[PDB]
Amino acid sequence: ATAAEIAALPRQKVELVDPPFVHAHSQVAEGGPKVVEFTMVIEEKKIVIDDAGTEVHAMAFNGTVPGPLMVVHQDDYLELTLINPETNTLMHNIDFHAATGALGGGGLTEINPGEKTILRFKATKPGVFVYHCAPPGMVPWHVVSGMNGAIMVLPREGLHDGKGKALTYDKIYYVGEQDFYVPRDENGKYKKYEAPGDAYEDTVKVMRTLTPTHVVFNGAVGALTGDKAMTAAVGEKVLIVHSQANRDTRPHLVGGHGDYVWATGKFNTPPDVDQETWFIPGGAAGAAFYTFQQPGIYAYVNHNLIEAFELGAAAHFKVTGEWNDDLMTSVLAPSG
Amino acid sequence: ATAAEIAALPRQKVELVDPPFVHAHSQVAEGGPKVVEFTMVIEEKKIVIDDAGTEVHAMAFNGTVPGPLMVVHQDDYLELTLINPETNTLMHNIDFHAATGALGGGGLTEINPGEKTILRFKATKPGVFVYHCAPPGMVPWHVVSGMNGAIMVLPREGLHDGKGKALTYDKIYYVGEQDFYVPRDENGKYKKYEAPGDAYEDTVKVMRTLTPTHVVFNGAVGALTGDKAMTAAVGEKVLIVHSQANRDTRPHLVGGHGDYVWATGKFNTPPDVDQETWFIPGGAAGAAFYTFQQPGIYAYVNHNLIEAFELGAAAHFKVTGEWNDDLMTSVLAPSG
């Protein structure tokens, strides 16, 4: 397309929403290609990641960890206005794994505190993709400080299974998984720092052990539980997008399955089916489609159970509806 | 189907056998859907896992680590009677990843010592699936104490390749891989405990390093080597079911291949072919089909070779038959 043709395309400004929710969109594209506009302000901010009060100096796109899910359709253009407020202290940028050129956009979006930039790229490939900050020489530190999220590039005709049958979800959730490396003192207690820079040296030492102290969903142990548990109903079709920008994960819906899973996150790659536990490598996003069949509470976890239950990688789903005794029944309840 | 229809299905009791062997079954279903009954007694007992007398207080379904492989066909019902003797000290339950609802059955099978329960579930999806104990609040501790196994839900018409041709094995083995986390004193010696609970704190500390002290097959270093090597003959077709309920593994048959590998373990997902090393994520089972072409001793390992040869994840296959010089030949033996 020529600059003239792109300039003639319609523009649509989208208001982002905080994970695990996803901004309104249509699965099947409405009309032809458009330039979809998003705006995100970067906030370096202290966040608490567990019940003990452990703090992390997060580097957050749009103020959240993970950053929000941006949704467009194949061949649409995503135009991001990225702002680094003067209140921040570090330079930041953004690398869209969905984009082509200049290190995912990283080479064209380096902004110091007090600056902004607008990047536009054509979303030529359909799938879910990670996006993350990557300042030369300080790449992993920004990413494991929570500066990452994902986008979804839907095929213009929506999702289909491996044989061409349409797959239409009733609702979608975006689960961003984050590995944190928090320094500890001599008593094994997590340390707190005044400014982000103060924690750098101590944090890199922990990062080098390749052993996170916390592995969480939506920025904190238990973030997606209780009144923040995800919800569904028997018969409801749910797409769960999951990302991990730095480390491998293996999602599992306890009590359910992944009916169709684009484990690589790419929609032109046929989805695996009837999955118990799928695998998403560090640096990628994946998506699982499931139709709930039983009511009750479900856990959704990274299936290295130590990471799930000791480190924080566990969420819950509350599901309404009628119990199905054909699928499962307690013939004899626990008894002597 | 109707309530009367389910109640009218035949019921069949099957006797289990210890891993790596598998109980009698037919690859193609015999007759229509049935309710297949199994019974397993849980045994908490000390087992020695290496050549230095290292002990683990195992939590073993049917007295073995891994628990036995249960085999049924798609749309049969699996009805398990699970028994927790009064001589045990902990509450246990079971989550079948093959099942749908109540956390895989975990929510309906919590049995204290002195209790039993009977769970029935319809095996709606074909494939090999992990099953494991999962008491709320102590899930990884039970799983890494060896309380896990797998089941195989065969398609009613048996296995097929990606093109629809039948794949009929001559024999099948079940290799359960276990990551253990045994505490050590300050001198580096593995600690011993009187009761399972006594080791809880020390064990969770090791678990949090995400670094197992041992990674073994069939519950101990060298359990499937030497006089306990698995066997085959040139020309024989073998299915090797492999599971890991908590941590990733990458099986490899040294000197062989995985001709067809359902790496995700699900039969409706076409198998990868001609594999050198496949990948099974923690929380899943996989299956590899191979026709032996050469006689001799083969090693079968988790291909992180440190895990295989330093930590214990190495098994052997002893294969009889005629050597094929076309496939391989020493043109010039080692010589000065």
Next chain:
Amino acid sequence: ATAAEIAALPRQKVELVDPPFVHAHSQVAEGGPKVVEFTMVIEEKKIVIDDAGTEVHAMAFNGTVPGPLMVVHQDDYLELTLINPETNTLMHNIDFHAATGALGGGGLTEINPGEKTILRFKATKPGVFVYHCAPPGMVPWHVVSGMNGAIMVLPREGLHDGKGKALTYDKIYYVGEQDFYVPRDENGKYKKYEAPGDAYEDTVKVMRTLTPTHVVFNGAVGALTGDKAMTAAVGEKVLIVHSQANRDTRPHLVGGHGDYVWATGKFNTPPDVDQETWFIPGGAAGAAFYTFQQPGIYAYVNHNLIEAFELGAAAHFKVTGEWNDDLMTSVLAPSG
């Protein structure tokens, strides 16, 4: 084929080149099956792997880490003459994951210093495969000392996508990724030794932590950068073969994609497409095909960013050509 039939086949002597380059070959087979001859001399030598002068006692096939890529076609025979110079101190052998029998050839190629051997095997399965040394009792030590490489067994008809359309590359690069476990002294300084055997005990203790001190490409931090950055031009199709003989990796071309990726490395397994980050388990090789569309510098990394940017797993591609503003453009460059 009979011994006589094999004896009658034409032979072709190949001259190997140092990674990441690949020796001359034809994608589509030129004529019928042949016996392709290769010769490699094993060199035990010191290599410096980081800018702090850290040393590793490398055990290098052909004198490099990784060993060179050998290319043949399906059903050709690969005849390797392996030499262990009297100047070396250890016995070595070779296991080709591409081969069938005798532990991949390892059981037939054990040569002490001063000996040589000639092994011939039929390349019956198409794809990229790892090859590595594996002396009984000291397998991982040789592999993590850099004694591994890969070979590519091309289909006779060249590469094809999942629907049969031909995929012909303009350039091919071989990236061998190595996990190193270098002992440190009481002050965190890396130790040096005057003999390979002298570091054995210290090295095994680090290996057991399953935590590498370095993760590098072509044997050293920054190896494939600067004077060694890989090159291409906009419009060129490039195949990147990547192997890791002992530990998992997750390749990612920063600013690009894996248009077609045989993640399992096997050509009869259809490639995944539009990949952002692919996964190669320890003990395997994989291959990604990409057509460059933007000029500039690209980073190529293992996407656990700590492994890439703290431990050393990062390479660069320098691409020439015209920038494409349709694919990506800076609407507003970084500014106040």
